[PDB]
Design a protein around this ligand. Sequence first.
Ligand SMILES: O=c1ccn([C@@H]2O[C@H](COP(=O)(O)OP(=O)(O)O[C@H]3OC[C@@H](O)[C@H](O)[C@H]3O)[C@@H](O)[C@H]2O)c(=O)[nH]1
Ligand SMILES: [Ca+2]
Ligand SMILES: [Ca+2]
Ligand SMILES: [Mg+2]
Ligand SMILES: [Mg+2]
Ligand SMILES: [Mg+2]
Ligand SMILES: [Mg+2]
Ligand SMILES: [Mg+2]
Ligand SMILES: [Mg+2]
Ligand SMILES: [Mg+2]
Ligand SMILES: [Mg+2]
Length: 281
Amino acid sequence: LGSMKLAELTLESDDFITSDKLFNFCKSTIFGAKYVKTDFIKFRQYQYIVSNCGWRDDTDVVFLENTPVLVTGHSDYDISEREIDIIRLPNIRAWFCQNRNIPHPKVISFPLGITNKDEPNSEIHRIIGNTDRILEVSKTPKEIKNLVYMNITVKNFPEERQRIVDLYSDKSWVTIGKGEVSEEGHRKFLEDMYAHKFCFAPRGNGIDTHRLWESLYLRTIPIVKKHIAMEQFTDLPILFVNDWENITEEYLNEQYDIIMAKDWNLDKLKIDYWYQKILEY
Ligand SMILES: O=c1ccn([C@@H]2O[C@H](COP(=O)(O)OP(=O)(O)O[C@H]3OC[C@@H](O)[C@H](O)[C@H]3O)[C@@H](O)[C@H]2O)c(=O)[nH]1
Ligand SMILES: [Ca+2]
Ligand SMILES: [Ca+2]
Ligand SMILES: [Mg+2]
Ligand SMILES: [Mg+2]
Ligand SMILES: [Mg+2]
Ligand SMILES: [Mg+2]
Ligand SMILES: [Mg+2]
Ligand SMILES: [Mg+2]
Ligand SMILES: [Mg+2]
Ligand SMILES: [Mg+2]
């Protein structure tokens, strides 16, 4: 009903999606959702019994046969056919997950969103988890320097990321950013991203990527390869590509005009949407 254009996006400091906010939300057992780090699903030693085993100081044993809402994240691991036995539990009303990798209506994707700043005793997390710096940049005048921003660690998924660097590095309509994860390097990254219409947001070790959401919060269009993990985000202004070949200035100019003209479900970018989505169970 209240959909809007990407350029009309406004953010408050608590809007930003992080996995910590959903984990934190689920800590209040009143809301009837159990949060399990995906590793404890993949390497379960019982078919239907799992535990966070002291992750986030949570040592509760979870009986999935008596769990109405399951939420998994804080892991590059996906939910796939290997978890079909858990999905088929008649008692489970919904499975909210990062990296959905099975076309099952019970399994609901949620955005990876931004790095968890509170990740105990981690400098990198403290830096690139700063949502205040995202909010800060998002309120400055958006002045476009170029068409597409490129700043990716190729090593993390080279079959896609190597093609992007090899094909597009030398284009006049591409701006390269050097990887720097200092507090100044992170600010520079966000300011660079903000000053482009698009950024390359290829998948990494995990299918979902922080860069995808960082781009959208800065009202920049992320370019992402089509994947079942992304199939529930088609109502966000993401440019979904079949492959990484034959991206041209004329192609992106046209896609910019089409995407910026449409209305999008931008409330999906705000954590309150996913609180309410869980609260519906
Ligand atoms: O110059 C830069 C570049 C990057 N960054 C930060 O670094 C983050 C990660 O960028 P990288 O390309 O190195 O990492 P990836 O995108 O491959 O991995 C990310 O998404 C996929 C998940 O599986 C990974 O756990 C997550 O780190 C960016 O989202 C951004 O927050 C900077 O702060 N400055
Ligand atoms: Ca690069
Ligand atoms: Ca193509
Ligand atoms: Mg069992
Ligand atoms: Mg996961
Ligand atoms: Mg998951
Ligand atoms: Mg992280
Ligand atoms: Mg990381
Ligand atoms: Mg990029
Ligand atoms: Mg992809
Ligand atoms: Mg063309």
